[PDB]
Design a protein around this ligand. Structure first.
Ligand SMILES: CCNC(=O)Nc1cc(Nc2cccc(C)c2)c(C(=O)Nc2cccc(C)c2)cn1
Length: 187
């Protein structure tokens, strides 16, 4: 299933050789945070381009659900991240690594995937007074060629649009490679 997305990545994410699909990957993750803001529950989304060839998206909403199905022993989070506006499970499938961190009901929950395959079960990693969801992913270099790094202006342009299409939401873009920071919010 995740094998199908890796065999024909272009079908799912867009062109893999000119940057298009690489940036679509971020937008897929952002769209999920935007939907939490449209549901009334998220006021700030933070997109950070890291210096290790990863992007993180962090929202301040309710947190992705963390419950376990008792008979299956798989968390809701894992179901969201592994099963097939193409969905975040596609992003996971085309990421050499993906880290999900969820702050919810006083606890921090974390899980790591490699090419979509979870490495261990969802685990509690501490306590928190805050709620929200953070996804950080390192795109697969077996999939993406030529443009394998994130480009601030492609994200900036798009995140500005989202902020004005979803008035009230605050969207912050941060680049760790040079300290560039933008804040998009409209009234
Ligand atoms: C960085 C990317 N941001 C997010 O993924 N934000 C996010 C997503 C959420 N749910 C969600 C995600 C993907 C697929 C589906 C169906 C739901 C939810 C969500 O549905 N939380 C929620 C909402 C109602 C009840 C419970 C238990 C949990 C909250 N935030």
């Amino acid at each position: 299933g995740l094998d199908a997305v890796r065999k024909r990545p272009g079908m799912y994410i867009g062109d893999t050789d000119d940057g298009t699909g690489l940036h679509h990957m971020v937008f897929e993750v952002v769209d999920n945070a935007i939907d939490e803001a449209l549901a009334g529950h998220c006021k700030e989304i933070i997109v950070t381009i890291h210096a290790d060839n990863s992007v993180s998206v962090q929202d301040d909403g309710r947190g992705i659900p963390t419950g376990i199905h008792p008979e299956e022993g798989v968390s809701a989070a894992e179901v969201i991240m592994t099963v097939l506006g193409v969905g975040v499970s596609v992003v996971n499938a085309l990421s050499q690594k993906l880290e999900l961190v969820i702050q919810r009901e006083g606890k921090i929950h974390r899980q790591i995937y490699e090419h979509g395959v979870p490495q261990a079960p969802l685990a509690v990693t501490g306590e928190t007074e805050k709620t929200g969801t953070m996804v950080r992913f390192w795109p697969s270099l077996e999939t993406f060629t030529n443009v394998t790094e994130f480009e601030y202006e492609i994200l900036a342009k798009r995140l500005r649009e989202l902020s004005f299409l979803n008035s009230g939401v605050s969207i912050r873009l941060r680049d760790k490679r040079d300290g560039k920071e933008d804040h998009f919010h409209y009234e």
